[PDB]
Amino acid sequence: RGKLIAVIGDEDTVTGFLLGGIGELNKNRHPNFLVVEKDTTINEIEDTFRQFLNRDDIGIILINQYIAEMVRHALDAHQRSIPAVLEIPSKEHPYDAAKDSILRRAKGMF
Amino acid sequence: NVAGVTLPVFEHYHEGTDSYELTGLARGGEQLAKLKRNYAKAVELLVELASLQTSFVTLDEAIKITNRRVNAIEHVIIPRIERTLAYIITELDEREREE
Amino acid sequence: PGGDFSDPVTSATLGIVQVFWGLDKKLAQRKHFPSVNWLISYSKYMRALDEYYDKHFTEFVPLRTKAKEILQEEEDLAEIVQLVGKASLAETDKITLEVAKLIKDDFLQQNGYTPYDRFCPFYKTVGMLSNMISFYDMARRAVETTAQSDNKITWSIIREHMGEILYKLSSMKFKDPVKDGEAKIKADYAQLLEDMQNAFRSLE
Amino acid sequence: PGGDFSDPVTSATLGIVQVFWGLDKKLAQRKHFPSVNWLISYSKYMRALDEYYDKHFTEFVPLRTKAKEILQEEEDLAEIVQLVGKASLAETDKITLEVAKLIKDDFLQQNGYTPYDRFCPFYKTVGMLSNMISFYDMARRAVETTAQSDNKITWSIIREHMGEILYKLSSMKFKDPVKDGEAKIKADYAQLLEDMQNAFRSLE
Amino acid sequence: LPILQSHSALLENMHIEQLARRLPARVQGYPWRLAYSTLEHGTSLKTLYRKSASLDSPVLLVIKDMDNQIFGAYATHPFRFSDHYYGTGETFLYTFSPNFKVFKWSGENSYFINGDISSLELGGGGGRFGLWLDADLYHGRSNSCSTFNNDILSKKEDFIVQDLEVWTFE
Amino acid sequence: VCLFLNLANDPTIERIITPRLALTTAEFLAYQCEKHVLVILTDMSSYAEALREVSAAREEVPGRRGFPGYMYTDLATIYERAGRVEGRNGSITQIPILTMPNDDITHPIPDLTGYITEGQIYVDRQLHNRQIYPPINVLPSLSRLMKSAIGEGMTRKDHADVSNQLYACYAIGKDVQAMKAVVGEEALTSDDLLYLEFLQKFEKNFITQGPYENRTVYETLDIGWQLLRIFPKEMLKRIPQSTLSEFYPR
Amino acid sequence: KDRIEIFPSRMAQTIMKARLKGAQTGRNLLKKKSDALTLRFRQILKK
């Protein structure tokens, strides 16, 4: 059976991919995404990231690049091959690879 | 399965049913139709990017495992053999001088 | 003394004998019998004997050569499978290893103490090897004949659809020259050639 | 035997002789005549000849030292080039590797089959090395002097703005003592020193 | 008027024109692109297959034998291995002898093009082939086959290829 | 031909005499009858065993691995009865065949031979088991003087270039067969697939010959070209562009 | 530790030379595997 993508991001980044068809509830009524309001504590974001990477249905996590810098500890602690993580740029946010975990794993990176 | 190593990747697949089909029916449905296509195109690229990442992490492990075997041969197995053979050639000369 | 033919008596023998049947501890230890190593062993009489084979067993010399070719390819293929695992092998190499196991276990191997194997006449022996190498030629051909086609034959497809044929090929050693006439054994082995050809026609 | 220097006649000879000129088949296969391996080779006589060089060639002691250091550094840097690619090295390391290549290609090689290289006098030899190491010191100075600047110097800037000096440095081997006297060869080599000084002064 | 090739070839401008006059409407007026050549690429059947296998277009075969005779075929599809026959009625064989000659489809059978593990072949009519080439593109055979009712094309029924090329339309 | 046959059971000192007897004939033919002689010695290991026996007959103490200490001088006394000479057209070539004990070139019989002879040719159980006749492995073989046997006015002028490039294409093709074991055939580049096909055709057409087929050097170089012609012209990097323009066009 | 301690004999000399050819072959093949994987890995990084 197919896996599903999951998203951590602001209202626009979540809304964009939801219209891109990404959104699914697990049968337990839990979503595959988190809307990061400015009031959300970094620990709640990290708990979500931990839940998503440890879940069996999720196959990719998209993290908006600014969130990836906040949750950076757990994001760099995550090292499994299957549950892939993409740090992604957005309209008011840093460039497409700002301290990217994969480019920091790489030996040939400048 | 190139060079005997299993590399995981993803294929993008589509369920047909649009859960947002009627959104903006009254207003904005023109731009929202462009938008759902643009983020579907973003996802299709991101699933390819994730397939590069799943391949990358698996290659990085398979290179390390292979290089540990190559270095174990180069710095353990071959040196034990070469020192064993040098000891053998020496003791064979000892048997020859004794005889 | 060590089982090693580098000893002065084996070395002085090998400079004189024209035939050598190097019994190998690795084969004896796995209880492969008669344990004669087919890479170390030799017979220089083949030159003189080709005038007999090209008169009494005119199919045999092509078979004898292709048998040694298979067994030598298996010595390379077995080494690379031990070093890197079998997943890289092309389908021709899987078939080469499979027929090398058929030869190695169901032609080359023989049990010294059972009525199937107390003596294996040359008409039985050539008939067996003819069938196994006809399977090798036809199986390898079937793959190469369907490489680049819309559907490709593979060792896995062969292992399924030729399964009864593989069992019959491994069973050829059980024919008994005391109870079965040479004509009967030869007729059964001729039927195996037809059975193989018709089974491959179901794949190609 | 097999290149194994631990062999008693070879090992005793290398225990006694104060110089080993390690000729190497790998260099001869690259046509790098005279094919002397500068990593394997050694000489113990430097401490004595330093009196002669101090009297007649007072610049040479620095030059010999710097040349050996550049070559030893390039042998270490080549492992980093294999690990992360040439483009990933620091600018100091890149210019060291480029000068080491200039030394390996146009100092350490010598075309003894041709008039300009049939022999190479010491005045020619020290002069060529004096220029190559002056180029090294000024190039590496310009790089390190412009460290953390906005307008940073690198080997590519040097090759673009003054690549004529690299061309002249490689050309200096072609001067012939039978045509031109040692004073004229030294004067041409002194002009290349002035040319490169003015070129480096044009950048930093 | 006469076609431009992307490179030099086995053919003269007068040969190019004489062949171009016979092109079908799918390929008329296109410049010719080199697919394979013994002058530019490895002399083997597998190379000709590999260089052609990425294509999905008609091709021109050209051969020079060791007796200097020029011959070949226009074909509706790329050369490849084939389990069965393939190609369609616009396929033809040809030679300069020294005058140009063409051998269009007879209508008798669909045996236009085939490729074996160890040969390339054109036509059918029992054991006969209108062209046949070995695994090296060294030995070849050519005789009248019922697919084309063709001449010998080479100087002799058995021939050795001096040089071979394949071209396509782009 | 002049043929000397010392049998395995003929008395051992006649086997010691046989090379001296043969070489004395070759010296007469070459240096007095002006002939170009080729001397073939069919198994120097059975001569080396005869030195060991005649040494034990004198009650000499056994030297290195039981052979006489002077075995080097005795092999030189055989092998150096060879060469061209000044003022005479005649010459003696020698081809000492030598059964290496235990397949090991380190053994004193091949070791001392390698110090005296200008090169070696290796016969290989791998090629022999593959049924390639003659099973001469061209890689560990080296004729130390081939560069002065061949070329313009001695053979065809392409020969040195053709042999260097055949060595490279066979060595690279063996390396590619060792790579195909690892990567699987679909991962090979087009260049690697050419070198792997060269290896198959080089063993099946160049090395494979059969015992009654005689090939001139010209017919061998023609086979050399019909094999090298499998590559694109630019891949023949060990051959000069002049030699390619003269001989690459078929 | 430093050596395999097969007892000195012409047999053991031959066995150690056979192991050396096996090990040098194993190094070269596994080094080729590492080179191919390294090339693909550098290609993937660029992609």
Short mmCIF file of C-alpha atoms in Angstrom, two decimals, chain A residues 39-101:
data_model
loop_
_atom_site.label_atom_id
_atom_site.label_comp_id
_atom_site.label_asym_id
_atom_site.label_seq_id
_atom_site.Cartn_x
_atom_site.Cartn_y
_atom_site.Cartn_z
CA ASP A 39 2.17 31.27 19.36
CA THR A 40 3.07 27.52 18.95
CA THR A 41 5.90 26.38 21.32
CA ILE A 42 8.97 24.77 19.65
CA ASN A 43 8.42 21.67 21.88
CA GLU A 44 4.94 21.10 20.29
CA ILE A 45 6.53 21.40 16.81
CA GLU A 46 9.29 18.96 17.81
CA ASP A 47 6.72 16.52 19.29
CA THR A 48 4.84 16.68 15.97
CA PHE A 49 8.05 16.08 13.98
CA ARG A 50 8.86 13.11 16.30
CA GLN A 51 5.30 11.73 15.89
CA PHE A 52 5.48 12.09 12.07
CA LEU A 53 8.93 10.44 11.70
CA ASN A 54 7.94 7.57 14.08
CA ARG A 55 4.51 7.00 12.38
CA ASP A 56 4.28 4.10 9.87
CA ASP A 57 1.83 5.73 7.36
CA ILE A 58 3.92 8.89 6.70
CA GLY A 59 6.68 8.49 4.05
CA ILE A 60 7.94 12.14 3.63
CA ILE A 61 7.87 15.18 5.96
CA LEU A 62 7.97 18.68 4.42
CA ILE A 63 9.33 21.23 6.94
CA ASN A 64 9.22 24.93 6.09
CA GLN A 65 12.88 26.13 6.17
CA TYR A 66 12.41 28.53 9.12
CA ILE A 67 10.87 25.70 11.23
CA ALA A 68 13.79 23.42 10.33
CA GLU A 69 16.13 25.99 11.98
CA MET A 70 13.95 26.02 15.17
CA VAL A 71 13.49 22.20 15.48
CA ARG A 72 17.12 21.69 14.24
CA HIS A 73 18.15 19.40 17.15
CA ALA A 74 15.53 16.69 16.46
CA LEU A 75 15.79 17.26 12.67
CA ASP A 76 19.56 16.53 12.73
CA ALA A 77 19.00 13.66 15.25
CA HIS A 78 16.66 12.01 12.66
CA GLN A 79 18.78 9.69 10.43
CA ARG A 80 16.43 6.94 9.00
CA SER A 81 16.58 6.29 5.21
CA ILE A 82 12.82 5.85 4.42
CA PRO A 83 10.97 8.78 6.21
CA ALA A 84 12.60 11.55 4.11
CA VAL A 85 12.62 15.20 5.32
CA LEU A 86 12.62 18.20 2.97
CA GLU A 87 13.55 21.63 4.29
CA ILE A 88 11.56 23.91 1.88
CA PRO A 89 11.66 27.69 1.07
CA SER A 90 8.61 30.02 1.24
CA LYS A 91 7.44 33.63 0.55
CA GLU A 92 8.89 35.41 3.68
CA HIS A 93 11.54 32.74 4.50
CA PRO A 94 15.23 31.73 3.95
CA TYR A 95 16.79 30.08 0.83
CA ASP A 96 16.15 26.46 -0.35
CA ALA A 97 19.18 24.92 1.50
CA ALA A 98 19.95 27.10 4.60
CA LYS A 99 22.14 24.68 6.72
CA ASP A 100 20.48 21.70 4.97
CA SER A 101 20.99 18.36 6.82
#
